[PDB]
Amino acid sequence: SHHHHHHSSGLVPRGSHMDVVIASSGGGWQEAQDKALWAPAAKALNITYTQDTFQNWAEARAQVESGSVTWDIIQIGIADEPQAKAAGVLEKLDPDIVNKADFPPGSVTDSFVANSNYSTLIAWNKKTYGDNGPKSMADFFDVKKFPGKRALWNQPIGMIEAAALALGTPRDKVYEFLSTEEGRKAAIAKLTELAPSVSVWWESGAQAAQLIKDGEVDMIITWGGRVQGAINDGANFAYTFNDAQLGTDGYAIVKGAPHRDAAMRFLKEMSKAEYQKDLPNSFATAPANMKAYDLAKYTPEKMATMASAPENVAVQYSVDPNFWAKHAKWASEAYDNVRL
Template sequence: MNYIRHRLAVFSASALIMLGGMVSASAADIVIVGAGGISQEAQKKALWEPAAKALGWTFEEDTSQSWTEARAQVDAGAVSWDIISLNMGEVQLAVDAGVIIKLPSDIVDRKDFVPGSVNDYCVGNSVFSTVVAYSTKKYGNNGPKTMQDFWDVKKFPGKRGLFRSPRGNLEAAALALGHSPSEVYDFLSTDAGKKAAFDKIAELKPYAIWWDSGAQATQLVKDGEVDMIYGWNGRLQAAIDDGAPFKINYKDGLLDSDCYAVVKGAPHTNNAIRFIKEISKPEYIKNLPKYMAYGGANLKAYAQYDEKTLSRLASSPENAKQQYPTNVDFWGKNGTTLSEAFDNMILSK
């Protein structure tokens, strides 16, 4: 995430609170917050709307790019959100900051979920991957096949789209330096490894277009502003489905998951817990790929997918075996420090 932007968001939210601009507790049964764009729209259609109908509830939705915006509400004692979606790698940061609550141990059956997609504070909603996609108009079918190719600006000239965050980029840089997926986090756990990875990312600064949201990544691909991009598979697939001449390469993709958490001091805490339990059922999760190329975290939904659907999901067995999982403990421990270092690297000449 772009932590400079997030700090500004927190400041703005805090200012609204002080000015009395924060929304009071909603009259709806639940207020749920997503990341916006096609991801939020997909979750609304597949999960939120049918679950609310089944419960006989009404819901309101909002959009946020960072859990730190929820922190501003908690710190001000003016919480208007119930459920927020955040990345698994951010959960420990939110816990340490006192922003989200511990969930009941029986909220879901963890054995039914993708390993690592459920913990004491968050329940997985979607599984995605950060992957390379490249322009077939520019490279044909001979685009970059490895992270070393992604960094090779002589063999593959052109603009690169990169998320304005250390997450994913540090792992990719470690691969570009010649380390295998199994070695990535051991390498990044050393000071020398972190420095080498940041130096490697800095090599791409003259060729990089930094994106801040999934919607922006989709638009960069659709508009042809980048020749290749390292981004979230569902957002990239959406651009391809809209006609963008790009191809996704799942090799060395970084598997990850987003999850639902309940904000501390939420106006409808009990409803929020019940709603997460409901929307995590396979009868809703199975419909998620109808609206976006993301699989749900509940594995019971996968038995109902055909081959075409599975081929578009990062979490399908065939695609998943080419990838490696995000180490959320690494990001929980190092996220804040690495984000500050990343911002400094971006802003330096």
């Protein structure tokens, strides 16, 4: 070349050239994955690993584009999977890595294995409705049957789909309905028709949870763990997984990973039921491997709270990250107009 590829850090590298590099968001989530999945799976395989942190998948794209791939396994969201797969950032995983049958629909791809699941669900104020709150997207969108203050996300994901389900669309045909210009317009028109009754467009889960606590909303579509966290904090709220959107977090191996073969062994191992079952012990999440439930032995009351539980998976629809990859531009500006 015509420039330095490396610079003299008078430091002796701490790890080994056999250490698989695994990265996530840092903090408690990374400590939780490490204690539950990474450290036990590594001890089992008799391999070694090092931890790194990152805030966006685009950082891995930069490594691939530059030819400086230092990470092996990256912890991303299913939302980022179509974009990263199309950009040549992710390595295609081995066929037998996992059995899709052990995981909810759309949570496993040729370049992505899920580690956890969450839900965007309907919650309501018991002070307003008691036990008789909205128990579907149709009920949530009915200002005649259920009058009151609605709170929606300021982002369109899960919201346009809620409008489509409200229009009578079956859970399994949500993205078939939204595949046409006619269906997309109908869904936005439904949001507009409800817009006057929407008192708040919440920005973050921390804000959403504080609103549930303070009794400022009559009903809301937010993340389950925020609603459940606030019921535990003392909020007089109730909720349902009926018509909720099942979301996914997981792992991918970076294209040109220095320890590609070892990272593959490590990913196959940490996805096992025996490691997955310990993930909710330290963090408010649901394991993606449902075989983990044979191992957890939770109470019926505990089970009803889990996003990935068979009883709750059956009443949900999985997010289509490919739909959102294709229509993210239209959706944003169409939804922005509804809020304003």
